[PDB]
Amino acid sequence: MLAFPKEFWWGGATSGPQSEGRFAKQHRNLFDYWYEEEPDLFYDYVGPDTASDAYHQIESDLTLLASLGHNSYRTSIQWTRLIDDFEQATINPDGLAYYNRVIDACLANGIRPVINLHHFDLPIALYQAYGGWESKHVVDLFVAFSKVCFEQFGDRVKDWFVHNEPMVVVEGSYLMQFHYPAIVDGKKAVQVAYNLALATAKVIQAYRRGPAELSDGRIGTILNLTPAYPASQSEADMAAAHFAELWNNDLFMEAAVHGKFPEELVAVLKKDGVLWQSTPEELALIAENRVDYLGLNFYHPKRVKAPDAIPVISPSWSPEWYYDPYLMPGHRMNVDKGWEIYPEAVYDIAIKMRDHYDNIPWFLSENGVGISGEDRYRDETGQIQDDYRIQFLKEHLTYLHKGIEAGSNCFGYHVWTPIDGWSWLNAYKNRYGLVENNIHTQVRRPKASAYWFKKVATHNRLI
Numbered sequence: 001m002l003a004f005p006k007e008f009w010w011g012g013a014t015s016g017p018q019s020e021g022r023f024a025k026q027h028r029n030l031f032d033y034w035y036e037e038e039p040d041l042f043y044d045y046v047g048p049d050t051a052s053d054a055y056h057q058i059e060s061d062l063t064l065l066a067s068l069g070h071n072s073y074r075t076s077i078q079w080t081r082l083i084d085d086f087e088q089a090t091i092n093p094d095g096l097a098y099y100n101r102v103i104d105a106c107l108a109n110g111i112r113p114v115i116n117l118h119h120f121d122l123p124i125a126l127y128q129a130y131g132g133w134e135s136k137h138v139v140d141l142f143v144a145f146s147k148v149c150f151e152q153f154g155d156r157v158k159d160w161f162v163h164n165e166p167m168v169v170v171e172g173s174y175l176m177q178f179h180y181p182a183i184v185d186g187k188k189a190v191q192v193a194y195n196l197a198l199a200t201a202k203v204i205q206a207y208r209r210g211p212a213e214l215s216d217g218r219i220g221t222i223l224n225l226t227p228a229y230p231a232s233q234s235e236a237d238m239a240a241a242h243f244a245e246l247w248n249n250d251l252f253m254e255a256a257v258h259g260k261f262p263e264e265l266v267a268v269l270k271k272d273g274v275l276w277q278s279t280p281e282e283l284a285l286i287a288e289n290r291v292d293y294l295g296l297n298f299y300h301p302k303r304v305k306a307p308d309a310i311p312v313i314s315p316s317w318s319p320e321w322y323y324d325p326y327l328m329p330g331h332r333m334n335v336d337k338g339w340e341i342y343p344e345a346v347y348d349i350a351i352k353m354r355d356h357y358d359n360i361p362w363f364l365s366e367n368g369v370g371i372s373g374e375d376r377y378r379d380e381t382g383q384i385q386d387d388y389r390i391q392f393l394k395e396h397l398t399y400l401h402k403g404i405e406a407g408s409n410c411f412g413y414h415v416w417t418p419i420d421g422w423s424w425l426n427a428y429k430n431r432y433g434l435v436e437n438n439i440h441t442q443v444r445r446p447k448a449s450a451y452w453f454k455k456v457a458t459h460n461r462l463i
């Protein structure tokens with residue numbers, strides 16, 4: 001009854017750090033380091049040394065996902081696995097052989113490989129040596145890494161993404177304490193945000209300069225366009241939502257798609273004394289090197305209100321000077337996670353793409369629901385009966401269909417996550433998979449939602 005466009009992408013998304021394990025990985029990323037130093041910050045003390053064992057099981061995993069109707073698979077290449085000497089971007093031979101296994105197994109199974117270059121996994125040595133994303137030299141080393149990827153894999157990978165949710169890195173590392181170095185420094189946050197956007201444009205330049213047979217595909221970035229719904233229509237609450245959009249959405253969207261930063265945001269940052277350092281050459285690189293397409297992530301809505309308190313001084317600049325989170329009485333909620341469920345937001349994102357971002361191509365690159373204690377839902381056969389996940393995916397997909405019918409140029413849907421993976425500080429507390437992973441034996445077992453999504457992907461339709 002709800003039919004999707006021809007050649008719609010169906011599959012799911014993961015990342016190198018959350019799936020691979022550290023098996024044969026030369027360097028530590030920020031999270032690997034963090035787990036080494038403070039394991040008790042991680043649920044059940046599970047770090048990323050093994051994660052979901054994709055280092056060993058990628059081939060058998062893609063075979064399973066092919067049998068479950070997936071035509072596409074998004075993961076990430078780890079800078080910390082592929083590169084030996086960061087300053088020269090020399091190649092670790094085992095990492096190269098590893099990403100060649102991943103990509104070749106994708107194609108052998110008829111799965112389009114979709115490759116992200118950064119998913120919260122800066123090398124710790126670049127943080128220690130230079131301040132990480134605070135450094136424009138680090139940005140250059142990221143570019144050199146991206147060039148290795150395009151040269152080595154671009155004959156077979158035609159679908160590239162520079163970052164996953166760069167504002168999450170900015171917030172995690174420099175505002176809200178959920179990535180390492182977990183410091184609170186707005187001036188740094190703002191410069192990191194500029195540097196991530198500049199890195200996006202430089203990687204795009206590098207991709208497009210590659211040999212023609214390695215540069216004929218598409219390159220984008222993965223962003224959030226989650227609306228910041230105002231608590232009310234008061235002037236105050238609207239101005240709160242307005243600023244929350246400027247920061248959380250517009251900064252990276254305007255730079256990715258239109259090659260400019262939003263002027264209003266710039267005036268706020270300048271007034272507050274925290275505007276990034278830029279050069280005219282960097283700004284022209286950004287204007288000239290914009291995305292072919294986007295991934296847009298959605299997995300819960302955000303609401304905001306006018307700030308409850310105006311501090312006479314703050315410890316550091318924060319976007320939350322201009323808004324607070326708001327909880328809407330009567331919202332639908334996922335109790336394990338403390339997150340509102342509001343699938344209508346997918347339609348709103350679709351309409352925004354249509355009307356404000358020239359309807360360029362985009363896909364919903366991460367959509368899923370995470371639950372603990374899924375043991376409780378196994379039936380007689382031992383299969384997890386995750387009808388809550390079927391229902392969640394079905395609703396969000398229904399609103400994606402509504403957006404495509406209204407004219408939004410959406411070309412795909414990726415479930416977070418094909419197989420249970422390691423979610424950072426929460427490790428395996430909450431499971432998002434269509435397919436269960438036993439984290440002690442690394443044995444997989446499809447859940448009911450895997451067979452439901454198989455049907456949807458294979459018939460190219462819902463209901």
Ligand SMILES: *[C@@H]1[C@H](O)[C@@H](O)[C@H](O)[C@@H](COP(=O)(O)O)[C@H]1O
Pocket residue numbers: 015018164165297299366370416422423424426430
């Ligand atoms: C999106 C993100 O890209 C992915 O890495 C995370 O695993 C998921 C789920 O988050 P939690 O594990 O915090 O629930 C999204 O945040």
Ligand SMILES: [Cl-]
Pocket residue numbers: 164165166167168222223224252
């Ligand atoms: Cl983002």
